Design a protein around this nucleic acid. Structure first.
Ligand code: MG
Ligand code: MG
Ligand code: MG
Ligand code: MG
Ligand code: MG
Ligand code: MG
Ligand code: MG
Ligand code: MG
Ligand code: MG
Ligand code: MG
Ligand code: MG
Ligand code: MG
Length: 122
RNA sequence: GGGAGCCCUAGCACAGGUGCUGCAUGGCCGUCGUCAGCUCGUGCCGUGAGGUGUUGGGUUAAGUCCCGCAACGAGCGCAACCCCC
């Protein structure tokens, strides 16, 4: 179910345009298309998934990030399917560092959301 | 015979100056220019002066608006609120 599901839809991405560092993950190079190791993937999915579960187990929230076309929706859906913020459009500069500022903008969204369905608008 | 203004002389303390300096000033005015510009708060960059935002594409009478974007917002301006036709 693992390697089988992943092997039939995962790995074999990029070509020459790699990154020295990302070498301990590379498996082979058949067809100028670097082939990442899946047996080492499950190894990280283990630790990764383990940390994710422990985070949500203690009531932890995760902010998914995915703008690249092929992922926009996948993120929006997979995100809501769990209930947690997520920016698939354009990652504004300061979303984290400038939270107070950026986040403060949210208040406006709520005000307008209620003001639009109010009377004053009449 | 004392006194209030008040009027006078004489003396005292003071008044007056369109006399100087706009190169000690306030206030008001002109001017670039009704040009569309000039900045700030936090964030990020740089050792620093500073930068970004406000560089770019299209659009407008316009930093007007739109689309982009490590920036997200805001202020003095633009516009609108005032008068005339
Ligand atoms: Mg003089
Ligand atoms: Mg003078
Ligand atoms: Mg002068
Ligand atoms: Mg003067
Ligand atoms: Mg004008
Ligand atoms: Mg330098
Ligand atoms: Mg610094
Ligand atoms: Mg600055
Ligand atoms: Mg700044
Ligand atoms: Mg600047
Ligand atoms: Mg403006
Ligand atoms: Mg901009």
């Amino acid at each position: 179910v693992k390697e089988l599901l992943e092997a039939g839809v995962h790995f074999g991405h990029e070509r020459k345009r790699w990154n020295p560092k990302f070498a301990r993950y590379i498996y082979a190079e058949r067809n100028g298309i670097h082939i990442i190791d899946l047996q080492k993937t499950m190894e990280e999915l283990e630790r990764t998934f383990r940390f994710i579960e422990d985070l949500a187990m203690r009531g932890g929230t995760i902010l998914f990030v995915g703008t690249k076309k092929q992922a926009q929706d996948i993120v929006r859906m997979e995100a809501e399917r769990a209930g947690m913020p997520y920016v698939n459009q354009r990652w504004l500069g300061g979303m984290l560092t400038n939270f107070k500022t950026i986040s403060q903008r949210v208040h406006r969204l709520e005000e307008l959301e209620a003001l639009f369905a109010s009377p004053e608008i009449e």
